[PDB]
Amino acid sequence: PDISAKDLRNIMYDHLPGFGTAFHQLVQVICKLGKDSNSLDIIHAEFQASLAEGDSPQCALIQITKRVPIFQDAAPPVIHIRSRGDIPRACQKSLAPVPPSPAIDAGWVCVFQLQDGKTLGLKI
Ligand SMILES: [K+]
Ligand code: NA
């Protein structure tokens, strides 16, 4: 790819406010699935265009989830953690009960699964 997953992640991070936000996590999800589906260059191009159009970087990421085929009805990744405390502070107000068939394109970034089995969905 013209761009690596790490470099794309860093370009997206360059534009995002704060640290450990729902959108940082979304960047990670996007770069993972994009690397796996060989979509890194299309993702990069779409991100660039969205920024040029005047979109917020957050909106650009969302639009990526809506336009890039790998994200269509794609299940959010499950992230195993010890306790809710392992969830970044800036994500703590973005947690919600997990529905039966969550989809990334619908704003379900990931699902945090606690050791005790309880789940929390990261929602935008
Ligand atoms: K930042
Ligand atoms: Na952010």
From Swiss-Prot:
All copies of the VP35 IID domain together span 2-124
* Highest taxon of the lineage: Viruses
Positions of disulphide bridges = none
Record-listed cross-link Glycyl lysine isopeptide (Lys-Gly) (interchain with G-Cter in ubiquitin), residues: 93
Cellular compartments annotated: Virion; Host cytoplasm
PTM entry text: Phosphorylated by host IKBKE. Phosphorylation contributes to efficient viral replication and transcription. Ubiquitinated by host TRIM6 to facilitate virus replication.
Which residues does the record list as Phosphoserine (modified residue)? 94, 101
Q: Record's domain comment?
A: The interferon inhibitory domain (IID) binds dsRNA.
How it assembles, according to the record, is: Homodimer. Homooligomer; via the coiled coil domain. Interacts with nucleoprotein NP and polymerase L; VP35 bridges L and NP and allows the formation of the polymerase complex. Also interacts with VP30; this interaction is regulated by VP30 phosphorylation. Interacts with host IKBKE and TBK1; the interactions lead to inhibition of cellular antiviral response by blocking necessary interactions of IKBKE and TBK1 with their substrate IRF3.
Q: What does this protein do?
A: Plays an essential role in viral RNA synthesis and also a role in suppressing innate immune signaling. Acts as a polymerase cofactor in the RNA polymerase transcription and replication complexes. Serves as nucleoprotein/NP monomer chaperone prior to the formation of the large oligomeric RNA-bound complexes. Regulates RNA synthesis by modulating NP-RNA interactions and interacting with DYNLL1. VP35-NP interaction controls the switch between RNA-bound NP and free NP and thus the switch between genome replication and genome packaging into the nucleocapsid.
Give the UniProt family note: Belongs to the filoviridae polymerase cofactor VP35 family.
Can you name this protein? Polymerase cofactor VP35
Please name the gene that encodes this protein. Answer: VP35
Shown residues in whole-protein numbering: 218 to 340 of 340
